Amino acid sequence: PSWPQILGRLTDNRDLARGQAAWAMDQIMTGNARPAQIAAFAVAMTMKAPTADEVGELAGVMLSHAHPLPADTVPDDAVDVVGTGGDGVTVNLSTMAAIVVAAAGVPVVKHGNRAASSLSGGADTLEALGVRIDLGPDLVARSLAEVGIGFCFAPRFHPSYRHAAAVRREIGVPTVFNLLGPLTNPARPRAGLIGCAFADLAEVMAGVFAARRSSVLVVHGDDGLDELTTTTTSTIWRVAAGSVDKLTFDPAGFGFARAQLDQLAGGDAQANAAAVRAVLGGARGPVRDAVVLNAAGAIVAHAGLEWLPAWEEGLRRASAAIDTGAAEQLLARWVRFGRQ
């Protein structure tokens, strides 16, 4: 195996052989790959049109180098709530959804990161709320048990990935690496709500989760958002029993009104943090509807471990988690945990 071999096969518009993608990623995750080599592989992989197997191999190598949590500290039915990002458009729907879902009794372990293209990101907003994001495996495990939620800071759990992260910021363009985020949660939850900004690559991610036999809903808003949108219909690749099925989704059937895309606008960590306190404070509006919708999506995924009645219960549990104030309190206990 070598760089000329692998890179040459891609430029010829051919799919890689089994195991070649793994080799390339291991060279990167061990510091035996110069930036030039990293960039060439990332671009070539993207333009060739990657397969589920190829992307699956990349994520597998990252997890094998990642810091794991202590044995038997992660529940069997833990869920993730995270997106690829890079939609170009907003408030932190995934982070807000995560708090609600956790408060509803579903164990959540988020694997997030700072912003890359947006004015603010998930981890950035959590830091602005006083949450300690840079905790080690032992403490993340304690947090999950004592609070009901844990946050895995990618740079701390994937320290060997820093070389690849540097190259990404230099080339600046979206690549296959932009898909690896949701696919490399070090806690390894078996369920989650996974957003994808790239419509022509969502089916691929769904394939990767299908191989792991996970219960996941890969979602893409017809308006382009990497979330379950309320401004129009959405596409959903439901993953269950290792089987993917493509379906169109419309929340208007449940009773959600249509919203404009500007009504879901956001800003910096300070402004987005305020949007979190507002929604968790019980404020109604288009932002709330987006959070409840996504939170329900994560609960439907959790249940996958009927279709319509699952959404009804999901929407019901999500709303109640907010209105009782359980979501607001859970956040407070999350902060106090870090200070102790």
Ligand X SMILES: O=P(O)(O)OC[C@H]1O[C@H](OP(=O)(O)OP(=O)(O)O)[C@H](O)[C@@H]1O
Ligand Y SMILES: Cc1ccc(C(=O)O)c(Nc2c(C)cccc2S(C)(=O)=O)c1
Smaller CB separation from Mg ion, 83 or 192? 83
Under 8 Å CB-to-CB from 1, ≥6 apart: which residues? 20, 23
Minimum gap (Å) between residue 129 Cβ and ligand X? 12
- 252 binds a second copy per the rule CB under 8 A: no
Residues that bind ligand X (CB under 6 A): 82-83, 85-86, 92-95, 112-113, 115-118, 121-122, 181, 195
Residue type, position 302, single letter: H
Asked if 58 contacts 52 with a C-beta cutoff of 8 angstroms, the reply is: no
Under 8 Å CB-to-CB from 57, ≥6 apart: which residues? 19, 21, 22, 25
- 158 binds ligand Y per the rule CB under 6 A: yes
CA distance 298 to 311: 10
Minimum gap (Å) between residue 58 Cβ and ligand Y? 14
Smaller CB separation from ligand Y, 113 or 229? 113
- 162 binds ligand Y per the rule CB under 6 A: yes
Annotated binding site for anthranilate: 83, 113, 168
Number of other residues whose CB lies within 10 A of the CB of residue 338: 15
Q: Kind of pairing, strands 215-221 and 108-110?
A: unpaired
Smaller CB separation from ligand Y, 165 or 310? 165
- 171 binds a second copy per the rule CB under 8 A: yes
Stretch that binds ligand Y, among 27-35, 95-103, 158-166, 266-274 (CB under 6 A): 158-166
With CB cut-offs between 5 and 8 Å by kind, which of Mg ion, ligand X, ligand Y, none does residue 166 bind?
A: ligand Y
Looking at residues 197 to 226 of the shown chain, list those that interact with Mg ion (rule: CB under 5 A).
226
Cα dist. 30→163, 187, 302 in Å? 9, 21, 35
Place of tokens 């947090």: 143
Under 8 Å CB-to-CB from 98, ≥6 apart: which residues? 81, 108, 110, 149, 298
Q: Kind of pairing, strands 234-240 and 191-195?
A: unpaired
Looking at residues 213 to 272 of the shown chain, list those that interact with ligand Y (rule: CB under 6 A).
none
With CB cut-offs between 5 and 8 Å by kind, which of Mg ion, a second copy, ligand X, none does residue 116 bind?
A: ligand X
- 224 binds a second copy per the rule CB under 8 A: no
Cα dist. 36→55, 249, 296 in Å? 20, 42, 43
- 173 binds a second copy per the rule CB under 8 A: yes
Integer-rounded Cα Rg, in Å, for the chain is 19
Under 8 Å CB-to-CB from 314, ≥6 apart: which residues? 295, 296, 297, 298, 299, 300, 303
- 172 binds a second copy per the rule CB under 8 A: yes
With CB cut-offs between 5 and 8 Å by kind, which of Mg ion, ligand Y, a second copy, none does residue 154 bind?
A: ligand Y
Smaller CB separation from a second copy, 46 or 229? 46
Smaller CB separation from ligand X, 168 or 238? 168
With CB cut-offs between 5 and 8 Å by kind, which of ligand Y, ligand X, a second copy, none does residue 162 bind?
A: ligand Y
Torsions phi, psi for 151 (to 5 deg) = -120, 120
Annotated binding site: 83, 86-87, 90, 92-95, 110-118, 122, 168, 226-227
Minimum gap (Å) between residue 223 Cβ and ligand Y? 27
Under 8 Å CB-to-CB from 107, ≥6 apart: which residues? 74, 75, 77, 78, 79, 144, 148, 149
CA distance 311 to 114: 31
With CB under 8 A as the contact rule, the residue among 21, 25, 26, 48 that binds a second copy is 48
Q: Which residues bind Mg ion (CB under 5 A)?
A: 83, 94, 195, 226-227
Q: Interface with ligand Y by CB under 6 A: which residues?
A: 113, 154-155, 158-159, 161-162, 165-166, 169
